[PDB]
Every structure is written in structure tokens, then in C-alpha cells.
Amino acid sequence: EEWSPHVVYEATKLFVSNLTAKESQKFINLILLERFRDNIETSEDHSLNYHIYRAVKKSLYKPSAFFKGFLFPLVETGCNVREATIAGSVLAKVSVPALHSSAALSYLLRLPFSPPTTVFIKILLDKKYALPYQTVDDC
Template sequence: MAQRFYNLILLPNVQRNIDKYKKLNYHLYMAIKKAMFKTSAFFKGFLLPLAEDPTTSTREAIIIGSILQKMSINALDVAAALIKMTTYEYKLANGYFLKVLLSKKYTLPTQVLDELINYLCKTGMVTREGDLEQHMADEEEGDEMDEDQMPTEMPVMWHQTILALAQ
């Protein structure tokens, strides 16, 4: 029941409030803090849908991430959420949530660490391989590449997530 409330009522209100005012209302902030006491329902009904949503802004991720940093969360729930987040496409918001949860320095099971390493390596390689293949094809054709056409690098958030994992 709580999970449905978080997903259908709390999440859209938080997103609307952040979109409209560029910050989070105090009462919604407190509602999120209270919601985190039911960690399983919070992750399933609020955080995971937020991380999966392609329209999640970086501002939303930073605001929710700051609440996550301040609260104490059960390590097993964090491990389950991390595994679930590795199934999503990499975006800055998703990467920020991974970084925040990893920076809490929980002792994570080996399976979770393996999944995270595979996810981050795969994300980096897919982007780089696609760019590298395009770069190689352009070189074979003899096309000169402009500065803006060079292979893209991974965002800083990706590197910060790897750093949080390594620490």
C-alpha cells in the first residue's frame, strides 16, 4: 500500500514541485524522509521509478540524493536497489543515485559488486566502442573530423561512480 502511494502520489508531486520551483518544498522533503523508514517500499515505489524515468532531471537526482545521503538505510535494501539499477540504461540521474548509495560505504555482497563492475564497464565500453567504430569508419573514408565529432568521453558522473565503488 505504501509503495503505491509513493509511486502514484508522492513521486509525481515531488517532480512537479522541483520542476516548478527549482527546489523541494519543506513538507515534501519531510514526506520523503518519513517514506524512507519503509525502505523496501521507498525503493520500489519512489527511487527505482525515478532512476528508470528518462525524463528525470539532474536537479531532481541531486535533491533526492541529498536526502539519501543524510538517512540511514538497510544495507540489504541498498544492495537490492543497486542490482536493480544496473539493469537500467545509464543516465546522469541513475549514475548519481549509484554514486550516493555507494558512497555510504556499506559492505556489499560479492554478487552486487560484480554486477556493478560489469555494468560500469559495459556502459563505458558500449559508448566508446560505438564512437570508436564511427571514428575508424570516418578515418578509412579519409574524412577529416572536427573537434565536435571526436569520440565522446564518459561523463564525470560515471568516473565519480567508479571512484565511489573503488573506495
């Protein structure tokens, strides 16, 4: 957690573009998530730098790894609104396959309600993908 955001960006590119779906799940859930929550939690204005945003952007190339590693325990650890805007712009800018976007929406609709979760569901509804009927029933 003592790296620079350039180092976290490059290591996220390395450890998502090479490691598999479960392995980059463990990488993002252990190394990126705790450094993420400690960059935003320990700061007095509770915002994030630009290169951690680019790291979370580059972590979505394997979408199983992204959703199973980044988004799903973060909302269960307390997600605020700068994380919502930043990781929602992450969730918007990168083209995600429809199945893991559908599993993500099926996750986020079940959560305890929060306007960060509302921003993430709003980004996943900006896709208008070919959703399975279970994801439609969760809506």
C-alpha cells in the same frame, strides 16, 4: 496533487510509518511520485521545495517501500538533476538497511545511463555496506 508540501510531508510520515512495505510502495508511487513530478515538471526552474524533500526523507524508514515505490519507476519516467541532488541527499541522510540499498544499487547500475543515476549510485557507494556478491557483480 493539490496538497501543500507540509501536508504531503505529514501524510508521508503517516503513510510510511504506519503502512507496510507494499502499501507505502503504492502510496509513494501513486501519490508522492505524481505530486513530485508535477511540482518539478510544471515549474519553470524545475526545482523542488524543502518539505517534499523532507517527505522523501521520511519515506525511507521502510526501505522496501522507499526503493520499490519512489526510486525505481522515477528513473524510468525521466529523472533530472534536482531530483538527483534532493533524493540523493535523502538517500544519504537516512540510515538504510544494507539489503535494500544493495537491491537499489543492483537496480540503478542496470538503468539507461544518466548523471542523475550517477549521483544516486555515487550516494549508494558512499555507504560501503556489506554488499552481497551479486551487487558487487553488478558494479
